[PDB]
Design a binder for these strands. Sequence first.
RNA 1: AAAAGAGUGAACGAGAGGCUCUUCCAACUUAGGUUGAAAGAGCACAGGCUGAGACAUUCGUAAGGCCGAAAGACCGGACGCACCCUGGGAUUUCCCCAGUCCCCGGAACUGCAUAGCGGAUGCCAGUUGAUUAUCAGAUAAGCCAGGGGGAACAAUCACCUCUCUGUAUCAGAGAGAGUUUUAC
DNA 2: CCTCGACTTCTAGTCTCGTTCACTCTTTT
DNA 3: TTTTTTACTAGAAGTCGAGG
Length: 401
Amino acid sequence: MAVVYVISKSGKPLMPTTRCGHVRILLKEGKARVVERKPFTIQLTYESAEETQPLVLGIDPGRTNIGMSVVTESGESVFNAQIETRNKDVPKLMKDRKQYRMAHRRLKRRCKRRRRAKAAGTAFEEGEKQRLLPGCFKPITCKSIRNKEARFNNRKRPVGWLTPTANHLLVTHLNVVKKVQKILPVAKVVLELNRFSFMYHALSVLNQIIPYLADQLADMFPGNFCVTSGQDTYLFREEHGIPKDHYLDAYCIACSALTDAKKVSSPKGRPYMVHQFRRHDRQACHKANLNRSYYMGGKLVATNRHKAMDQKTDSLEEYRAAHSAADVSKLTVKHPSAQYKDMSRIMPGSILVSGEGKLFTLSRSEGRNKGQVNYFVSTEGIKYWARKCQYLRNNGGLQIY
RNA sequence: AAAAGAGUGAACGAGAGGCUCUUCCAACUUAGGUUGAAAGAGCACAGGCUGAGACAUUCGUAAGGCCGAAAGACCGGACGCACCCUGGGAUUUCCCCAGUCCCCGGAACUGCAUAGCGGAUGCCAGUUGAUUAUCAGAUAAGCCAGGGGGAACAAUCACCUCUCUGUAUCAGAGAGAGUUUUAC
DNA sequence: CCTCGACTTCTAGTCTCGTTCACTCTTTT
DNA sequence: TTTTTTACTAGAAGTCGAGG
């Protein structure tokens, strides 16, 4: 039945097991010591032999659902996972980081300098200046003063420089291989090299990282790194009739390297689920409201005084056109103040226990009153009064649900 | 090889908005208040680093062409600069990285020449201690700031059986050796 | 009969356009 | 000539009881 992973006293991933009774007696015997609650690992506390039979790990690459599966040689299944990456958030978080940065460098230096210039009388006499900068053919308009040197001509990257979003995917894939190697004694590694010519979109960073992952996983398993092919995976899924399921593809990718695989049966049983939680959140501002709202009878009648970029709702300007000065003289303005996040908060991914004693993994902290989170939501979707909950462990990035 | 695809990373420049304040006008209610128009001034995660580096004007920036009466222009690429290299930093942290930036070296490489750098002149800081000196302090038109890990940190008993309560379920609590051994 | 409050319950968050540059992977041919 | 709507965290408004 269940498979209880085992680790040597020396901390060496030994073969797991499936005896159950002995895995309890041996816990009551104290001989052992839980090392993880899921997947259940038990480190022996009586140094014994550490024999470990050969195991193959089939990695099915992917940008949001990395799938892995360690299989015995006969073709038996000892582990099956389905990692859900956060690779789709990294790209957008960086676009925002850019806008934010460019704003800081426009509203806190450029303008300022342009303000201090006009004030000191140290500004272009024309007030504007077209400047054809080396590399461009169309000039750039500089108001009041010149432009901090633009650097876009010879910025060199190391060879094989991969973009933040791609690096992430790669590391992830490998970080998961390392977590699997701390529970089971992995020997060889099969990877399913994918292929998209480009001739629910994405499917791009994977094509760029597949090559680098293959190299990296060839040094992690020196002399033991094979590469299958989606096609083979399919041929297998019709040859051994593995019920088609995105998560049953890794078992197939892995069962390929196996030569005399006699006991190849679909790896039944729901596969473990791993969620990736961000490690650092250096953002401090939750919302800077940015809106001067007007309220005649306490109801918005002007979100600004004049429209803004993409502002659809009417602005005081429109109102003044529709109503009178006796009307505009009664309006009430209400601009809420910027809301800053609590940058030392138990971060989504932490492990906590409820007042009743249920252990859970923070998914999101909903609510705040008098400076105290109102509810800690679990990854299962239950809401617990934070005030009563207890902190146990911080985020680990890849966290099994 | 190009050719495209398909993502994703830089630097610099402009706006619409916004915040505060001033002046003025109008409106509306109690000299006052509220609101708006117009003009002006300042301000732009929380922060960390550093004391100056910003701006303006002017001059200087290789030989080699080649064209000019010349002056000069144009090409070129230096004994010029560099986003390039070597080293060292700031941001920077439990432990790392990215990015950006900075400081001395500049060989190759790579880039630029209306750029960049340097000089000159102008204009924009802060001065107090602890002790002429030294060590703090003060001081921006300095730089970086909304990216990625990893470690460590349990009130971590899973699975099978029985009993009890709830629960349409399922869930909760208690006890248990269930075939050895991770390999007879 | 309120009201004071422990909690529920629920909504909401900036945006666009200039002058350039980059590196990495697939495929076409 | 248009690439794709995500979602945690903060804070205001609301309800349910206390209770006196």
